[PDB]
């Protein structure tokens, strides 16, 4: 794809065919240098800075503790050659 269709410049290199969005999303296709691409919504390929996760501040207070009341017995699968 030559130039002239959603040309976007990132630190990885020239990116053609994806639109640069200002929002932050989980990384889907690792373009590089912190930029990921994904197929989102009509439909087009988007490029964005990856979102490391929901920025939640723990309500720390020198006086308060949080003890869980219920648990879950979760089974995790781990594959090893």
């Amino acid at each position: 794809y030559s130039t002239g269709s959603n040309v976007f410049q990132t630190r990885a290199g020239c990116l053609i065919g994806a639109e640069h969005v200002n929002n932050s999303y989980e990384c889907d296709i690792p373009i590089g240098a912190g930029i990921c691409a994904s197929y989102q919504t009509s439909q087009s390929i988007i490029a964005y800075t990856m979102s490391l996760g929901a920025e939640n501040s723990v309500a720390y207070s020198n006086n308060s503790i949080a003890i869980p009341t219920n648990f879950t017995i979760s089974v995790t699968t781990e594959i090893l050659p």
Binding site: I65, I67, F71, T72, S74, E78, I79, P81
Partner: protein
């Protein structure tokens, strides 16, 4: 309830393995890497490497042995280099797989054959069990782990000042629901009345920062009174 959670967890393992095609990506990648290595080694026979032909039978049939020897030597250099590259790549891959097999043996010994306190070694959470499951050229572990789920805020105090002597939780946490103070397990909210049995006294109320005033029930007193 724990039995139902465990059974549903196992069923979800089966469903997730069934539906997801990339569940066994590690083993499939190992097999694919080996297949690609063998395929490259086999396809290396088709390369001339600078000789007149890639098949040495045709070289011997066509040219006289004196001048054919240099072409056969070129073919030998090329194929020997290809074999050397394949063997070196296989040695490095065997080092990777031996590291992974030592890790798998360690996981077997420490999680199937016991309970491991190493964090995130066997499952995300407080590890409970682990079940090996044989897989083609590999092993699959079903790490049964304990994960807390429903948490609620509480007011905590490092010590309870009673009779001027600080009381500390023997094996628990001091928490309050605003009005009353309780000593509680660390990982599961179970409030008990503060008592000399679950608290060990050591020190004075002035030293501790954040100590709070409260009364520690003494089991002995009712027997004396009655």
């Amino acid at each position: 309830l724990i039995a139902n959670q465990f059974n549903s967890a196992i069923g979800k393992i089966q469903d997730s393995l069934s539906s997801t095609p990339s569940a066994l990506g590690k083993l499939q990648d190992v097999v694919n890497q080996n297949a690609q290595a063998l395929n490259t080694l086999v396809k290396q026979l088709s390369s001339n490497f600078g000789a007149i032909s890639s098949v040495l039978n045709d070289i011997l049939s066509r040219l006289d042995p004196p001048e054919a020897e240099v072409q056969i030597d070129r073919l030998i250099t090329g194929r020997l280099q290809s074999l050397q590259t394949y063997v070196t790549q296989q040695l490095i891959r065997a080092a990777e797989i031996r590291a992974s097999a030592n890790l798998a043996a360690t996981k077997m010994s420490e999680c199937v054959l016991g309970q491991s306190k190493r964090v995130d070694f066997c499952g995300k959470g407080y590890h409970l069990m682990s079940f090996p499951q044989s897989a083609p050229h590999g092993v699959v572990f079903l790490h049964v782990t304990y994960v807390p789920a429903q948490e609620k805020n509480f007011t905590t105090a490092p010590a309870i000042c009673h009779d001027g002597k600080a009381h500390f939780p023997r094996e628990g946490v001091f928490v309050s629901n605003g009005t009353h103070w309780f000593v509680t397990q660390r990982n599961f909210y179970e409030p008990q009345i503060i008592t000399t049995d679950n608290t060990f006294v050591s020190g004075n109320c002035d030293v501790v920062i954040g100590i709070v005033n409260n009364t520690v029930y003494d089991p002995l007193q009712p027997e004396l009174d009655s």
